[PDB]
């Protein structure tokens, strides 16, 4: 029957950094998400899109307890993707330079899924992440969120910019980072997300990570 996808995409300053000489990860992630919503809208399929932005100017979050849950705005709830949801991405030049976290966006995504799994039957729950993995990771709770993922029976997918380890422009069946695109903060971010995803369901999760 139906499906529900809850996109979370970064707008933080480091992810929206200036072009090193190829592109900007914000633009690449924006292109990918606009392609996804484009296919969804013009395919006229009965699926819901809930878009949230982490690392924003303000925090228009359903829950914001003190310092945590900050710079995150749930722009759209699970609703039929219309041309408004597409012009939104087309009219979202602002990055909102306050890089806070990404796991906060994840727990907000589960929160909104449980908040909107009412009155609408759903067989699949998917959440997408777009992150440079450049902010300080939060370890407020990791085991319980994994248990929540296991019990809610949802599958996530994480996308990261060119940094994985010729003039690579957008996609050419070749290299991802031109010379050296990763930092130690991004290195440990990739490490922690890899180990989290492996602990979730293992090597298949390591397969479900794409630039």
């Amino acid at each position: 029957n139906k499906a529900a996808v809850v996109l979370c995409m970064d707008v933080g300053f480091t992810m929206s950094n200036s072009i090193p000489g190829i592109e900007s990860p914000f633009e690449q992630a924006k292109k990918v998400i606009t392609m996804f919503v484009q296919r969804q809208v013009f395919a006229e399929n009965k699926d819901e899109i809930a878009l949230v932005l982490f690392g924003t100017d303000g925090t228009d979050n359903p829950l914001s307890g003190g310092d945590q849950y900050q710079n995150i705005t749930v722009h759209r709830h699970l609703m039929l993707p219309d041309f408004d949801l597409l012009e939104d991405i087309e009219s979202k030049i602002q990055p909102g330079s306050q890089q806070a976290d990404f796991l906060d966006a994840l727990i907000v995504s589960m929160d909104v899924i449980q908040h909107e799994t009412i009155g609408k039957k759903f067989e699949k729950r998917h959440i997408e992440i777009f992150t440079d993995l450049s902010s300080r990771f939060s370890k407020s709770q990791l085991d319980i969120i994994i248990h929540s993922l296991k019990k809610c029976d949802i599958s996530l997918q994480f996308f990261l910019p060119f940094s994985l380890g010729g003039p690579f422009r957008l996609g050419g069946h070749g290299p991802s980072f031109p010379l050296k695109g990763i930092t130690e903060q991004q290195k440990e971010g990739l490490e922690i997300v890899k180990m989290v995803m492996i602990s979730l369901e293992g090597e298949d999760g390591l397969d479900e990570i794409y630039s």
Binding site: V41, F42, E44, L80, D82, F83
Partner: protein, 490 residues
Amino acid sequence: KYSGRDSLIFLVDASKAMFESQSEDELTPFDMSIQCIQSVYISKIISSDRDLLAVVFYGTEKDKNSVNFKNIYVLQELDNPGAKRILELDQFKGQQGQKRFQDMMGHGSDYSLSEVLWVCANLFSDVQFKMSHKRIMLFTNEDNPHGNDSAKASRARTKAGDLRDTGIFLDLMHLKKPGGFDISLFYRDIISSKLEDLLRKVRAKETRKRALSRLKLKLNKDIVISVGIYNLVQKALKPPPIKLYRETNEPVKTKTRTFNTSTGGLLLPSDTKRSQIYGSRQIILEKEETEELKRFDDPGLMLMGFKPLVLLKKHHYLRPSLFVYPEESLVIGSSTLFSALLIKCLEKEVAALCRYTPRRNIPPYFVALVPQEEELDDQKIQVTPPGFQLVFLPFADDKRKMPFTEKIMATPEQVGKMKAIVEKLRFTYRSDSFENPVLQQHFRNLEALALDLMEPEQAVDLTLPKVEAMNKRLGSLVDEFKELVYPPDY
């Protein structure tokens, strides 16, 4: 030549010896010839309904032809086959048709065998079409039309060579006088039985040979070789119906138009646009716009590189393969590069990968030019030509993902008995002969409707399984398979 229609004149013998059945009640050879010509008409009226066919009778009493020789009767001047002519010959079937033949023109006379060849030549020479092959089938059983004259024989040989030089090839199938080929005629000079095929070999087929595309295989900057993209296998389908007027059986000349912008008035192709209503909002753009948003490259093939034949796994099929073959007349020297690529790719077992674009405004689509080696023998088994095979490659969504959540193996002992069964049923696939039941039945029903004879034949479906044959040829081992580990258990 491409537009060269084939020609065939039927020259049957009506002198004395085909109106008696050699003291048998099987079939008079004249009737055998009429059966053969009926078969050829009904075959080429749906196989090659552009070729010209003619029926000419010699040795008859009265005469008809453009020269007015005696004892030569042209029943039909050569032209395309039709139902009228098949019926006109059908009125001479059997003994009743035999006596009908007797009374309309009448057998028994001194034919010349040099005036009749001249009449055949005139028939061939009086048509205004490009002919690919002129051929004359001589239906006769007699050996010596010259039994009492040698001048007649010399004139016949002269006129036979005189036919041959103008590209008219005479071939002779002899109606066996005793019913078996032991009458060995010495006329290997005149001619250039094999007849059961001519009674029924090809129930339905077609004829052609054409490019279907003339493209440029470009080596990505300027090295362009012209090349034809032929269609080796096509999936023919029944001809389209014709709207026909009830009261007179005439084509009705349809005409479609759009009008009435709530007023009543013709709309030209310029005052309309094309729209798609998505969600709530309607997107509008004009016809040339909706033709041009699918436009990536110019027509032709462009190499994306090379991949060995191994890693393109041969269940990625969605569109029947085509056949690349070099065409030099567009750009000269293409065949040299084509041969070099063919040889090198065959020796390396590597197929080229191209971006195919057949027509001017059509999205590019990825193809693999898999080399194929021409095979041939002393018998001249030309069953695959040299060149490339375009395997069309799926993109990402032409593929579909399936449940896949099922994995259960069987013990390595049912495999043995299935092996028993399969080696029991092992058979050579075919060279031909699985003709479409729907298409063949359509042709047979149409034959019946046009000739309104008795009622339509039932095409024997070669596609059906010989169920009793399998059941008997396996015997008592399929039941052994059914109940070895898994009874119904009720």
